[PDB]
Design a protein that fits this description.
Radius of gyration of chain A: 37 Å
Entry title: Cryo-EM structure of Photorhabdus luminescens TcdA4
Organism (chain A): Photorhabdus luminescens
Order of helices and strands of chain A: H
Oligomer: part of a larger assembly
Shape of chain A: rod-shaped
PDB class: toxin
Keywords: Toxin, membrane permeation, complex
Distance between the termini of chain A: 98 Å
Protein name (chain A): TcdA4
Largest interface: A-B, 5 and 5 residues
Chain lengths: ~50, ~50
């Protein structure tokens, strides 16, 4: 009962290549607040800022 | 709870914005900004896919 033919040999499966996706988002920029005038002249307000 | 599916799903941020902003295009029945996906499992597996 030993077969004369030799058995066929299986081919192993292909492994999966794990891949990541890196995307970026776009947040909208902020606008300016309102111009509020003050009492001070230029150099004092400049140094303060 | 709802942050945990965001952690475990691994979806990127832009498609997540797309999913919340337009749930109907991902196959939920449509209703304008009222058609809400729950935290049920059929609307987990489709995000995962």
């Amino acid at each position: 009962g030993q077969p004369l033919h030799l058995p066929i040999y299986a081919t192993p499966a292909d492994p999966k290549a794990l891949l990541s996706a890196a995307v970026a988002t776009s947040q909208g920029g902020g606008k300016l607040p309102e111009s509020f005038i003050s009492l001070w002249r230029f150099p004092h307000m400049l140094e303060n800022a | 709870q709802l942050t945990m599916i965001y952690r475990s799903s691994g979806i990127n941020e832009n498609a997540f914005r797309l999913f919340i902003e337009k749930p109907t295009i991902f196959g939920i029945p449509d209703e304008p900004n009222k058609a809400t996906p729950a935290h049920n499992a059929p609307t987990l597996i489709i995000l995962t896919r």
